[PDB]
Amino acid sequence: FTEYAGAIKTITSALQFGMDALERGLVDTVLAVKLRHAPPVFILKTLGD
Amino acid sequence: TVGSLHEALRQAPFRQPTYGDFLVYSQTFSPQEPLGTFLFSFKQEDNGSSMDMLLTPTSLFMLSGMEAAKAPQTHKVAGVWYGSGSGLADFIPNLSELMDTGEFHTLLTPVGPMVQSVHSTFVTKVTSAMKGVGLARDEPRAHVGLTLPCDMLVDLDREPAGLNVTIYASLVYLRVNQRPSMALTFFQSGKGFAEVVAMIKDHFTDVIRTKYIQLRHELYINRLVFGAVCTLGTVPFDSHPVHQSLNSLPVLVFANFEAACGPWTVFL
């Protein structure tokens, strides 16, 4: 009983850190999109006027 | 989710490895053998039909006769386990003539790593693995990986790798002190068979020149066989060898080594 409970608390928790890995991956890939369309200040300012 | 993965892991048991029960004279197999030692087999005659002979890479160093120049570290270990080698060498009376005509590599059949060996006084039980990942026989299942010394293993290295890197076994006949004596090294590359045979020839550049010049006053046709390469099994790529010192003796140990076999192929 303390061994069947010592296994399902590892298999579900490893999926909790797999489910955590996507919300961490959402913020990474949005910021990966925002930086690949991010020209710096010294280029854009004279183009912006 | 939890419920969909609750069933998708139940339906996959992996196959079990095979087991070859070996039964050895206890004077040809030391008690202090590291669990994970690679093995061999020698089955010259057939009249006894009772007991079997096994050779470690440490015990084969006593039968070979390669000096401590090309192999210093096991020479301390092969002597401290076998004094004069009389417990080993008395069984084979042709240890100077099998090295002449080149028939020793045809008799060895590689087996694999150890599993469980109960040491005994007269007849030592030995269990090894031939296929599959090296696992234990009994209830305390411990994953026994294959162990090689740093003295015998010679590595071959952008290198694009597949799902495969293999371990070989070269066995090269030569003559030191004007008496025949073989030499054995271990390789590790996943380069395919068409490259390693072109690479082992560059590992023995300064050896072929120091035989055929030494044997030009008299040369025999039965001397022309020079080596034999087997194929011992596959290592999973991205798994690293682990350095380990044992009473000392630096020994590399692999993990997840599944074992196979192969025919001995001549190269020159």
Added chain:
Amino acid sequence: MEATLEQRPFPYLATEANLLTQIKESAADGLFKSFQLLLGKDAREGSVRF
């Protein structure tokens, strides 16, 4: 623009009369254009994409 064939999983209709007679000959020598064979391990509705 020539009208082509496509394997998109249409809601097909069934006709009372049959079709199947002499079709096996007609693949080898073309009775009709715009045909594509399908073997039974891959004769299905494809996954719809757009």
Added chain:
Amino acid sequence: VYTNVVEFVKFLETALAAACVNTEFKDLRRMIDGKIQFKISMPT
């Protein structure tokens, strides 16, 4: 036995999401492409 539990994060509860319009799409593996055709008229 002493364990730690890492702090979990939500995407929509971060202030990053002012720079994104967020529509959940159920079967994106069934998509090939997408497009937005702008039509800019111009005065003179």
Added chain:
Amino acid sequence: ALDKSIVVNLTSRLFADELAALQSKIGSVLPLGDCHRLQNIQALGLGCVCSRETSPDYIQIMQYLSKCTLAVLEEVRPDSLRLTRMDPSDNLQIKNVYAPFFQWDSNTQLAVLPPLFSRKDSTIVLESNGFDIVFPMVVPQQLGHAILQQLLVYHIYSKISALDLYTTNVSFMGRTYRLDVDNTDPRTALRVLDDLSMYLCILSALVPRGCLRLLTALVRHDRHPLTEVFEGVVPDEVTRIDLDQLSVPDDITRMRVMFSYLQSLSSIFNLGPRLHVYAYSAETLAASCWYSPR
């Protein structure tokens, strides 16, 4: 069981002109660098060694190919290539697309070879990324070796020359095919010829004398079918070896040693990984092979 595929990120996009080639060659075989899931284009090209700016190395390309994994295309999206890989023992379904058309059958024996019939045909370019995806080709082993037979003959008779119909063309039964050999880098193919020269002269010192005498009694008495490589004229060198007497117990110690070196010519006539076909269809061009490397 085992759920596998490979999706490949094209880093920016790709055009509609170059998509017409990647769509036309679906169901083909190409290698790739490492067995990841997610992947860039700079591993799928076989022409990371078959470059345009330098001359290629036909042996080194083939020597590269027993290393890497092999993969099959199934779908093409204009930003992502979706493939499937080949486990070392896995019954899959391959399709015969490859443009020099050689008919297969059930229980044939395939081989994966570098593109040697045409370089420009099997190398399509992707200048949206500055890279060219280079396809290999599958060939049955009756020409799996018979191109490597012809290629090793060519590098011998280039140094002697430095005629042009016997040293280049490859003869399958029925037809001939011109190789695409114009500017090569033979500095790793002459090592291979320096690895025939050791095994071949050893096989010229322990030639069994009984088999030499059977040539003296066959090229002038009867007319065998394949003795017509020779004429009736025997070589003069065979009689200059024949003059020593026979020895039956020394045609065993010469036959056994000669037999051991012909296990060694499976180290220089190696192909890539092989495809044991067990079921083939003729009007669908779809086979079902069994991958097994080495």
Added chain:
Amino acid sequence: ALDKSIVVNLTSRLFADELAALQSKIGSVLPLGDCHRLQNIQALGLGCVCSSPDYIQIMQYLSKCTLAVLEEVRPDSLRLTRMDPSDNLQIKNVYAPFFQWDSNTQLAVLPPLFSRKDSTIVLESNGFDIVFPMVVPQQLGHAILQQLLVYHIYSKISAGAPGDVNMAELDLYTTNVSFMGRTYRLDVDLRVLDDLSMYLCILSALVPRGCLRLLTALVRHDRHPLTEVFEGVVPDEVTRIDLDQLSVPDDITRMRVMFSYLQSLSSIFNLGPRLHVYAYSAETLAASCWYSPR
């Protein structure tokens, strides 16, 4: 899980004498033309190509085959079992003549070449003859051929010139095979090896011309340094072959022939329908193994 059973349905029943021969051979290794589970008797055994046979047209049939194992002979229908690669089995040593397999050895599959009383089984009720392959331990299978290959040459030397072959010398070291501390008698009066005696002899004169034409082309500042040693092993008479007496478009015909025998003779001994026995008993003739193709 997976299922495998190859039921061979018969037309007519088996007789009493026809059945008791196959009762003893209840465990064996047999070739088979395809892997679908309902076939006739004309698809198993080597009699598809063997029933004036050749060696090579059977050796290029075993490595391109799917071998099956007998388990049961019921009087209306045979039954087989398919053999996967890397599959545990249970083989009964039943083959004629007897050879005494040693445990922990390697077993190869070779075509039969002795008299027909020991190999085939004549079935009168259905008019087909099954042909078993010859399962030999792999060291003896490379040894039983390399002496009869010598013996078939001296059967052709003594047919044209009798004084060169001595029957006291020939039938003394070509009828005893010293292997595994024992000897074995062989029943030989051949027709199976009538091509290897010609392929090894048509290769026998092309090697001395070959290993000088290949060495005159390979000489430069960057020779591979091992062939400085292996230049001396060739005899002095081979080093005086003047190749002026053969033209350059004749020399190409003496290379593409030459290399093609060097491969196709070397390949038929590195063909591996072989199986590694791990357990055996002598007085029961039981054995277990695993299979690994090519």
